[PDB]
């Protein structure tokens, strides 16, 4: 049969194994799919169910890897529709609309187009359009959406009330094509043959008050109605003034600069000017203070570049401050963890959002998740920002868990059997791992008796005994080992300076001096001008 | 069927001054104290983006700065407006650079033309650059993936930014700037 | 700041808080590290709620789903005030260990779920909710007595009903899925290099154009130098 | 006939990287190639070790 | 697979039988992302400006805010 | 400022705990030592102000007058009562009132205080 003839082919094995080896390419997915479709080409109900199960699972498994592909949710829906079950088509349209958080123009337009044919019960059908309207209605290109909706009223509705009702709303929206709908409005004003039909525009009171025209007027009506059409066309000309201004600004500044409105792939790069125009377009949209159009223009901006973390951070910021919604910001950063490749800034800002939200079990859980990613070695990671952001928020947790061991009530932040072994394992790698001194500088921050003794003996002493060359040639090491003794509150000045000079300094080897002197002079120049000479005589 | 219902809108050009120039970067910062150095002003305008600096006039109590990208410039104008430097509320807006300033001042005496010349563009595609981003310090073979910042500028050399080393370098200079800043060496 | 006197006070002034809302469903998930600590608090909580109005669904792979349905407003005032304080107590005052007594200087925070169909300040609805068919509400930091008043004023407005029977099972499905995705996302974090991307062809494609984008930058630096000086 | 594989769950050391039934994110591969597939990833694991 | 409308599923098969008898006298579906990897290399035209009514064409703001080339 | 905020964020995470933390937010104003430095970093004048009346006084603010173009304050026409917030399902109840406008005379009026010319070139 055709199925087994497809399995034993070499191209299926090669294309498949490429996909499973390289998941995020999307080039191998689309070849695997385009091939398995073409093998099935008489795709109608006759073809055997094993093959349909494979091709279907191939679509559904591809759309999970790339949650933004509009033409593929559409295409898989159409496959299910040609195959003869519309319920599966509905469901996976719902799935695509849910992947975009209910705002994508193409899935709503291509969805409702499908919905016109397969759904009776006019009321529900219109509820689909009212649901689409409150989401994607204000999209700059959404006019063609409205062209559907108006097209569906005039065919369905005998009353014509709802057509005036909706078209009146379309007049106030700064779409890309506003003029198309202004022509329909002006024409429908032109076709009004009676005073009674002017109540369709607005009610009886606002016409007699604002424009001072009466529907009940009794007399020679014709010239009065001709005056009324002029008085009605003037204000529509004014609405045309405002909305034209807005559209021409939005196009002339932003929308004209945006050349790519679609997702492409995780391997796509976008131009810098396009980034800049998305940023400024989002600031402008925020300034308009229209929440629907604001979330829309974030989700609109999000699919062109989803993988940077750039628009994710901002879209968490405007929602954490302007709207003052902290949970919504957490949820934005969580959905940003999936698409964004860099993930470091999002996970730092996410640690902060979770801290302020006062969910500690969720943050500590997520630290367990990120340490489980590396197989419980975060200390061996190449990229330092992950280990550092992990280590300081981990510290903030174990301060709360375990009561402080040390006198003066100082919590033990970075000195603990769990974390100090992590730090020391990070330090034992020396030149190979990047962080180094940054991790060391924060070991000087304790400022007490017990902890200056602890950090004195357990690192700065052992590191001398093992005698590693990288840490001894370094001036930051000796500078920090001076600043650790020098800021102690237990020591007086005499034993402090005498301890630094009589012990700390002579432990430096004279061959290291050339590297050690510049950084260790900066400590002595500021704090110890008196003993500056005995420093120079040593080296 | 001669005339048509719709046309594309045609619109006039606004004379090209330094206020209508979409490429303008340099921000004129007026109302300074003239007790301030230029390295202090750099400290103010550094975090908003990478700077190609121009000059601070002497005795004129107004300076100006120039960034690489306009997004950083606007982020600096909106970021600092009315922000006191040495107890003087600062008033800053758009302004040109030094050479175009010379070309203007020669015209101010002779009151002839004052024909502006807009700043040069970046010839835009660029897929590697992310505007309003700084390389905090200086072998790199990267993946060139979208999330990371591929190219960048140096305080005039285009450098490839290593995402791992950039954070540890920036934090290193951060912890140095505190110790030198407290004792008076850096300001 | 004791829950019983405050619950009687809200019994008095709430204008008929006794009756239960039709088709009423409330879902609060929570995670606790100590199962032995939470099992006794919930066990002591089931005494007055008669197990029909409140049910605890554990999820094992610690995460508990707290489902509270067919409830009067005065009942949710009681339960949410118990649980939201028990969640903070582990970090705040582990020595307290009195379930119904809220220790001083603890502000109640958290989030709860309601069905997407509800018909309508400390308690706020969030924009951009994750779980598709449901809506989550934030409770901003508040004193307990303030929380009773805000919540009692909140459930007076909401009028909702007509939910499918097993919907809780749908909530489990969605909620487990969303965090499965972010866990799978954190497991993709270290392996970004070369593992799933096929970087060889990607570098072969992007390197020549990135070199040109660099040439245009080193061109723009000189082209700007000629403009400034 | 066909096995369903999750290279993410496999490289992350998690248990369920494969199953016979269709699940949301897995890629269908030929069963005999499964062993072969493991080979293709081993060097990646070898880089992490 | 979507906007070409000849190669679709719902409307795809019908267009073939809708082709005229063609008595006397393309965009295949197989395309992938691998073609046109960078959508902008001097390829695209910028988006066409929004139209305007011929009647009210004098309503337009006279001058732009910025200098276009 | 970025330096004190970042270094103090790290210092606070390392040397403090939660019991000290959650007691440290008044909540009259929104302030947290973990999160607030992250919002305040590039913004010197950031004020965490929660007010509903900023909605009433809106559109007279310079951020509204310059939005898509900075330094240049245009006066932009707008419809006083705008329907684009109300869904079309909620419009069919009552007939929609006629649009009330504002700022419609100033469409061509675009003003700039030129701060480069008059305080520098003019001296």
């Amino acid at each position: 049969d055709k199925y087994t003839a497809l399995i034993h082919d070499e191209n299926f094995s090669t294309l498949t194994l490429n996909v499973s080896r390289y998941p995020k390419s999307l080039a191998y997915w689309e070849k695997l799919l385009n091939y398995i479709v073409k093998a099935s080409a008489p795709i109608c109900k006759s073809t055997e169910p094993q093959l349909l199960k494979l091709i279907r699972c191939t679509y559904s498994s591809m759309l999970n890897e790339f949650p933004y592909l509009e033409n593929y949710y559409i295409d898989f829906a159409l496959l299910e529709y040609k195959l003869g079950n519309v319920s599966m088509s509905h469901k996976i349209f719902q799935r695509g609309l849910q992947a975009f958080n209910q705002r994508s123009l193409l899935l709503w337009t291509s969805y409702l187009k499908f919905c016109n044919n397969v759904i009776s019960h006019q009321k529900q059908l219109f509820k689909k359009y009212e649901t689409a309207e409150e989401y994607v209605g204000l999209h700059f290109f959404s006019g063609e959406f409205w062209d559907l909706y108006l097209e569906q009223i005039s065919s369905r509705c005998t009353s014509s009330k709802k057509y005036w009702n909706v078209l009146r709303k379309i007049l106030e929206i700064p779409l890309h094509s506003f003029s198309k709908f202004y022509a329909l409005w002006l024409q429908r004003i032109d076709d009004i043959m009676d005073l009674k039909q002017l109540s369709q525009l607005t009610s009886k009171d606002e016409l007699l008050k604002k424009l001072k025209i009466d529907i009940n007027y009794s007399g020679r009506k014709g010239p009065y109605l001709q005056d009324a059409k002029k008085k009605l066309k003037k204000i529509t000309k004014e609405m045309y003034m405002v909305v034209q201004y807005q559209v021409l600004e939005i196009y002339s500044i932003f929308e004209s600069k945006i050349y790519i409105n679609y997702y492409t792939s995780p391997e796509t790069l976008v131009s810098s000017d396009e980034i800049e125009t998305w940023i400024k377009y989002l600031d402008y949209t925020i300034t308009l203070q229209t929440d629907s159009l604001t979330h829309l223009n974030f989700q609109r901006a999000l699919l062109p570049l989803a993988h940077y973390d750039l628009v994710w951070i901002k879209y968490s910021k405007w929602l954490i401050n302007s709207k003052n919604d902290l949970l919504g910001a957490k949820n934005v950063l969580l959905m940003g963890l999936k698409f964004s490749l860099k993930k470091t800034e999002i996970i730092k800002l996410l640690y902060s959002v979770i801290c302020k939200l006062n969910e500690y079990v969720l943050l500590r859980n997520l630290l367990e998740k990120i340490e489980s990613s590396y197989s419980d070695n975060v200390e061996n990671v190449d990229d330092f920002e992950i280990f550092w952001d992990y280590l300081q928020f981990k510290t903030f947790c174990q301060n709360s868990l375990y009561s402080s061991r040390y006198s003066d009530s100082q919590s033990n932040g970075l000195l603990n059997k769990e974390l100090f072994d992590k730090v020391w394992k990070r330090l034992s790698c020396k030149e190979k791992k990047s962080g180094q001194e940054i991790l060391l500088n924060n070991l000087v921050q304790f400022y007490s008796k017990d902890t200056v003794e602890f950090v004195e003996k357990n690192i700065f002493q052992k590191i001398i005994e093992f005698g590693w060359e990288y840490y001894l040639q370094n001036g930051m090491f000796w500078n920090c080992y001076c600043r650790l003794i020098y800021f102690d509150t237990s020591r007086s000045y005499l034993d402090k300076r005498q301890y630094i000079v009589r012990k700390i300094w002579p432990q430096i080897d004279k061959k290291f001096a050339q590297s050690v002197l510049p950084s260790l002079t900066e400590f002595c120049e500021s704090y110890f001008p008196e003993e500056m000479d005995t420093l120079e005589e040593m080296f | 069927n001669h005339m048509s219902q719709f046309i594309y809108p045609v619109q006039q050009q606004p004379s090209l001054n330094h206020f209508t120039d979409p490429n303008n970067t340099t921000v004129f910062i007026g109302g300074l104290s003239s007790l301030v150095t230029e390295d202090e002003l750099r400290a103010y305008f550094q975090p908003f983006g990478t700077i190609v600096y121009v000059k601070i006039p002497v005795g004129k109590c107004c300076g100006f700065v120039q960034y690489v990208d306009r997004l950083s410039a606007e982020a600096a104008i909106a970021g600092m407006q009315g922000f006191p430097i040495a107890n003087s509320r600062v008033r800053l807006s758009w302004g040109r650079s030094a050479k175009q300033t010379a070309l203007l001042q020669q015209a101010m005496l002779s009151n002839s033309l004052q024909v502006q010349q807009q700043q040069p563009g970046l010839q835009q595609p660029n897929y590697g650059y992310i505007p309003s981003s700084t390389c905090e310090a200086p072998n790199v073979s990267s993946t060139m993936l979208p999330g990371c910042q591929i190219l960048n500028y140096s305080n005039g050399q285009q450098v490839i930014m290593q995402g791992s080393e950039a954070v540890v370098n920036s934090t290193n200079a951060m912890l140095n700037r505190l110790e030198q800043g407290s004792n008076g060496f850096m300001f | 700041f004791d829950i019983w006197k405050n619950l009687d006070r809200i019994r008095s002034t709430k204008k008929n808080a006794g009756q239960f809302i039709k088709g009423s469903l409330l879902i609060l998930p929570m995670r606790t590290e100590d199962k032995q600590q939470f099992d006794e608090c919930m066990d002591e909580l089931h005494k007055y709620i008669s197990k029909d109005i409140l049910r605890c669904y554990p999820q094992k792979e610690m995460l508990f789903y707290i489902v509270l349905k067919d409830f009067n407003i005065l009942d949710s005032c009681f339960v949410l005030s118990v649980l939201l304080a028990f969640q903070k107590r582990l970090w705040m005052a582990p020595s307290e260990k009195s379930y119904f007594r809220v220790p001083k200087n603890i502000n109640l925070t958290g989030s709860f779920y309601l069905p997407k169909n509800i018909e309508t300040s400390s308690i706020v609805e969030v924009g951009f909710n994750v779980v598709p068919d449901f809506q989550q509400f934030q409770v901003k930091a508040c004193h307990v007595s303030k929380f009773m008043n805000e919540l009692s004023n909140f459930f007076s407005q909401v009028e909702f009903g007509k939910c499918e029977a097993n919907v809780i099972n749908y909530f489990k499905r969605e909620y487990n899925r969303t965090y499965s995705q972010i866990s799978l996302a954190l497991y993709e974090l270290p392996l970004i290099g070369d593992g799933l991307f096929d970087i060889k062809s990607y570098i072969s494609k992007t390197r020549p154009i990135i070199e040109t984008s660099k040439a245009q930058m080193i061109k723009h630096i000189s082209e700007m130098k000629a403009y400034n000086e | 006939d066909i096995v369903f594989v999750s290279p993410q769950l496999y490289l992350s050391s998690q248990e369920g990287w494969k199953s016979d039934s269709a699940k949301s994110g897995f890629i269908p591969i030929l069963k005999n190639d499964l062993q072969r597939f493991q080979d293709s990833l081993k060097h990646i694991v070898d880089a992490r070790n | 697979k979507v906007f070409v409308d000849a190669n679709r599923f719902d409307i795809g098969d019908l267009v073939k039988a809708s082709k005229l008898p063609q008595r006397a006298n393309s965009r295949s579906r197989d395309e992938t992302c691998e073609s046109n990897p960078f959508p902008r290399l001097n390829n695209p035209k910028k988006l066409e400006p929004p139209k305007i009514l011929s009647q009210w064409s004098n309503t337009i703001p006279k001058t732009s805010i910025f200098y276009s080339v | 400022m970025n330096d004190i905020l970042t270094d103090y964020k790290t210092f606070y995470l390392t040397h403090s705990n939660i019991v000290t933390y959650e007691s440290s937010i008044i909540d009259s104003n929104t302030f947290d030592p973990i999160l607030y430095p992250e919002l305040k970093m590039s913004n010197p004048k950031y004020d965490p102000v929660l007010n509903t009346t900023a909605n009433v006084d809106w559109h007279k603010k310079t951020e509204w007058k310059e939005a898509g173009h900075i330094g240049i304050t245009t006066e932009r026409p707008q419809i006083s009562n705008s329907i684009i917030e109300c869904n079309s399902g909620t419009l069919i109840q009552k007939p929609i009132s006629l649009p009330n406008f504002r700022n419609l005379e100033k469409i061509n009026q675009v003003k700039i205080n030129d701060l480069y010319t008059e305080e520098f070139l003019k001296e």
Side-chain angles (χ1 to χ4, degrees), chain C residues 48-58 60-71 73-95 97-100 102-103 105-161:
Chain C
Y48 303 136
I49 317 302
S50 65
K51 181 68 179 296
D52 182 66
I53 305 303
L54 187 146
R55 299 177 66 184
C56 296
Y57 300 91
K60 177 60 175 171
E61 292 86 358
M62 179 66 184
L63 191 148
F64 295 99
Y65 302 100
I66 307 302
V67 176
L68 186 140
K69 63 182 294 179
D70 288 343
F71 62 90
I73 179 171
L74 188 146
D75 188 5
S76 180
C77 295
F78 174 81
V79 174
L80 294 176
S81 296
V82 174
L83 296 173
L84 295 176
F86 174 80
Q87 189 173 356
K88 298 293 176 63
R89 180 181 295 170
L90 188 146
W91 295 97
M92 298 296 180
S95 63
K97 293 183 70 65
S98 298
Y99 294 139
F100 296 160
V102 175
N105 295 129
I106 289 174
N107 52 347
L108 295 177
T109 62
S111 65
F112 54 88
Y113 291 116
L114 293 179
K116 181 58 177 170
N117 49 29
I118 52 99
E119 190 175 4
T120 61
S121 296
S122 178
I123 299 171
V124 296
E125 64 184 344
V126 303
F128 187 83
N129 58 342
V130 173
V131 175
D133 196 7
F134 294 147
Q135 190 174 356
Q136 58 180 18
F137 297 160
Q138 187 172 356
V139 296
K140 292 164 62 181
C142 294
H143 188 200
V144 170
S145 66
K146 181 60 160 57
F147 178 78
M148 291 291 186
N149 289 337
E150 179 68 15
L151 191 147
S152 178
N153 288 336
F154 176 77
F155 284 162
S156 64
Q157 295 177 336
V158 295
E159 184 178 2
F160 57 92

Side-chain angles (χ1 to χ4, degrees), chain A residues 21-24 28 98 101 267 315 325 327-328 331-332 335 338 341 358 360-361 364-365 373-374 401, chain C residues 31 33 88 91 109 111 126-128 130 132 136 138 181 183 185-190 195-198 202:
Chain A
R21 172 65 180 88
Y22 297 137
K24 291 293 180 64
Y28 302 140
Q98 186 62 57
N101 292 283
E267 291 85 356
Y315 174 63
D325 186 11
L327 282 178
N331 300 133
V332 171
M335 185 169 175
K338 290 188 295 184
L341 297 178
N358 283 336
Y360 297 128
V361 178
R364 177 170 168 82
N365 188 347
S373 177
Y374 290 95
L401 293 174
Chain C
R31 291 181 66 88
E33 292 178 349
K88 298 293 176 63
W91 295 97
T109 62
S111 65
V126 303
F128 187 83
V130 173
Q136 58 180 18
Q138 187 172 356
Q181 292 178 334
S183 298
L186 295 174
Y187 293 133
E188 294 179 350
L189 191 147
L196 42 69
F197 276 101
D198 183 7
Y202 176 77

Side-chain angles (χ1 to χ4, degrees), chain A residues 447-452 483-492 496:
Chain A
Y447 302 139
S448 179
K449 178 61 165 59
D450 292 341
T451 55
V452 165
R483 290 186 294 105
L484 185 139
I485 304 302
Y486 181 74
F487 289 95
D488 185 5
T489 60
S490 177
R491 294 182 181 275
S492 296
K496 186 183 293 180

